[PDB]
Design a protein around this ligand. Structure first.
Ligand SMILES: [Zn+2]
Ligand SMILES: [Zn+2]
Length: 59
């Protein structure tokens, strides 16, 4: 059923399906070979790996 990512008090990071071509970690400005996760609550669509650099939850 629906991915209840909302369960977390912290960043949801909802993954965006790569449209048959690249996507961009808006955070990095660099292309996301892997499915970028987007915390729709406040931040950006970042590399899965880049999520590590986020030590502060939803604004
Ligand atoms: Zn990144
Ligand atoms: Zn957030």
């Amino acid at each position: 059923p629906r991915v209840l990512a909302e369960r977390g008090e912290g960043h949801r990071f909802v993954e965006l399906a790569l449209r048959g071509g690249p996507g961009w970690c808006d955070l990095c400005g660099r292309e996301v070979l892997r499915q970028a996760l987007r915390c729709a609550n406040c931040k950006f669509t970042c590399h899965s790996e880049c999520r590590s650099l986020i030590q502060l939850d939803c604004r």
